[model samples]
Target: MPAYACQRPTPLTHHNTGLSEALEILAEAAGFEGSEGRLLTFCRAASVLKALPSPVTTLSQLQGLPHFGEHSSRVVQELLEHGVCEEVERVRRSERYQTMKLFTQIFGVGVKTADRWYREGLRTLDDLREQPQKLTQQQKAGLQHHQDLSTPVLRSDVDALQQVVEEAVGQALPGATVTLTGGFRRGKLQGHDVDFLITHPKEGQEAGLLPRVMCRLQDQGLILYHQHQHAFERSFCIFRLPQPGSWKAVRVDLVVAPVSQFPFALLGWTGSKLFQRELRRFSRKEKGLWLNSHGLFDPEQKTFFQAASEEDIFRHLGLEYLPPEQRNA
Candidate 1:
């Protein structure tokens, strides 16, 4: 395994799908339990498998792999030796896991909230509905449209939405730009939500652009629901799109940045989350620097590195350039 996840090239689809899937279940289980460190370990193990050039068929094949710990290796060994891992199956059937998964599927609900519901013996959407007064506006919308929102957003759907967004943005800010990022930018066929990075050529012009474009979209009757309107540079929203027989709700995230930070914003939003995590880890451990969605800050130099493009950012981190499609780690 590569010392750093960014040091290896991971394609969108890998040879070890079964192994990775099993490991990811354990990772999700850890996350549900609030064991962040254990969750990360399992995630790293899954990422290692994703980066493999070939499918792992034997226990011996994982001997020297970096992230695959004894427990992870044994789990893979069982999957290869048998047809499945008993522990994984058990977790899949656990009431807590099932309950948490259901609650967390709501857009505004997270692990802690899910855990709280589980502790209260709430096991179904009906339970949530019974307590209408307890539901936040975002959660209410999320539950109201759970089925549609849970459906995957296809690449074609993202393209169509992008066109609409561009039109709205053009009306609000003539010179503003919108670029698709996230899984679609990495060439995935579908994603949980579509991500976009918006910017203006001139510095400071991008500020307040999100609300103007969103208002225009609302005027067009495309906005289904939105939250955090003034919280950050990002806007999280659900949009209504016309389909064959009926309209569908699609989740979309928009982030705005100045022209100067566009590249960093693009690179950050265009992530295989693990790839970004490992890249930042490598920057701090190997290069004595801090990297984030804003920019790369060099602690030793006491200054921030201004990157004109993603390549420049990689160069500053002393890493070989890995394009969006190859960052599936």
Candidate 2:
């Protein structure tokens, strides 16, 4: 296997689910403790297992894997013999890990904020609610919609949202397009939230498109609440979707990009989180190109590579083009 995950084709479902889950939990715990180095190591190790085509029935199968070190390998060894890793069990039941996981899962909350709340003895959503002054406006909205947000956004809701967004975009700008990105685009049946990238075929005409689309959405009362991010929106929002309960609160993000950069945005956003991370790493460390959702650039040359499509971006980076479903790493 290649060292970088971008060089691999990782499917959405794999044989190492149990092994990968344990490693990922430890990776989460590592992030909670602010050990970024360890977090990356654990996460990379999990991705290695994910890329394997068959179950790792023997520890010997991991002999020369790219990301597996003694620490990660030992965990697998323990699981193979005991059916559970003692360290993983201990971390799973730890108060800090549990609380950090709960807090960070809330929209707009990250490890830093969650760790701070844990330090302050705040244990639950109720605890944060009791101290409203401590929460940001975003956090307040997150808490208010916690119940609905906890539910998985289904494929049915994706269709509902896509129709509304497409309608709004059509009214806002004829010939403008909305493309679903993120985990859903990677073929996930359900997701925690939905992501859409909006762009127009005419490059310069796309300027200020977000405000126009958002206004139309709001006019139709499809938007339940937004952070008021007006000018060229990063539009973090809660959308009201048709549901059995009449309507349900669903989280949505709308990002507006010009046609010139649409390919880069789509390439960066459609893959799994770890796949993107690995791609950027390979671009920088191997190819000397800087990549982001915006574009790929050469810092020394002071130029950006214009990609006509997602395949163009991968080709420029000198890697095989792995489809979104193959990017589940």
Candidate 3:
């Protein structure tokens, strides 16, 4: 059995059938085959299975090399000897996965807090909703519209929203550009919602761009849900979308980055949240590389990891390439 499953170090044993295999099957369903995303997943599964043949005979054995590191390999050994890995058992029985699932569906939730909440009995959306006393505005909205926001958005609706946004971009910034990112850009038919990365190529033109465009859309009544932007770093800012009919808001992330950082920005916004997690983990745990949605910074090198494409970024981190469609970690 493998403990590190689907990029996260998860246990292979479970009450569910095909618990170990389901991870691989899920990856395949997400178009993850022979890619870094799939490779990471496969290696993680192998780590849990401990079935990587002894003696390391061929390249096929080395095929999924990146994910099958020494620690992960040892975990594999434990699996073969005992039919299960204790760490995997702990993680599976632990409430982390269950808690993470709640925040994973929400725009604001991330692995860190979700992992913490797992110990607090926050298993399902219903559990979350029942504790409205502890919810944030974003979490409340996430809980309120859990079903619709969790359901995939229609391509037709995305197109409709895109067209409306395009027009707004034209009106507010004149020549501002808006490109759809996230699962949609990666060719996913549906997702929790649409994400649009808007920018203007010229210097300083993007400042206040979101507000202007948002104002125009709000006047048109298409701005069913939106929030004022909040800045993080001097150059980065993010905010949540307004919800529809008092439900969890349809997520719409708007990011503005320099033309120089556009590639990284686009890749960041096109995240399958989980993929981003693995990237951050690899950067911090193995390579000492610090990566945020903004860009990857190498503290030792004292320079930013410049990338022309997402593949290039993975190369800089000594990992494999994950096709856009399969980049769901």
Stretches of candidate 3 off by over 4 Å are: 1-21, 24-107, 110-131, 231-249, 272-292, 296-301, 304-323, 326-329
Error of 1 at 302 (Å): 2.9
Model 1 score (lDDT): 0.88
Please identify model 2 stretches exceeding 4 Å from their true place: 228-232
Per-candidate Cα lDDT values, in order, are 0.88, 0.90, 0.59
TM-score on alpha carbons, each prediction:
0.97, 0.96, 0.60
Tens digit of per-residue lDDT, candidate 3, span 1-329:
22222233222222222333434433332231124565456435433432332433222444455455554454445555566666556544644443555566565565555655666867777777777776666666566556666666767667767787799889998878888888888677777677787777785788777778777777776554555645311211122233455422355666666655666777777775655665677678888988876688989888887776677777887766665665543
| Clash counts for all predictions | 0, 0, 12
Model 1 spans with C-alpha error above 4 angstroms: 229-232
> What TM-score does candidate 2 get on C-alpha atoms?
0.96
Ranking by TM-score, best first? Answer: 1, 2, 3
Number of clashes found in candidate 1: 0
How far does residue 260 in candidate 1 sit from its true spot (Å)?
Answer: 1.5
Best by lDDT: 2
Q: Write the per-residue lDDT of candidate 1 for residues 1-329, one digit (tens) a residue.
A: 57788998999988999998989889998999999988889999999998988889888888898977898998999999998999899988998888888999888899998898889889999999998787888889888888898899898899889999999998899899999999999889999889999999989888789999989999999999987555238888889987889999988998887877888888889998888888889999989998888888888788988888999999888788999999988
Candidate 2 lDDT over 29-126, as tens digits, reads 99999999899999999999999988998998989988789999999999998899999999999998999988998888999999999999999899
Lowest lDDT block of 10, candidate 3: 231-240
Local lDDT at 163 for model 2? 94
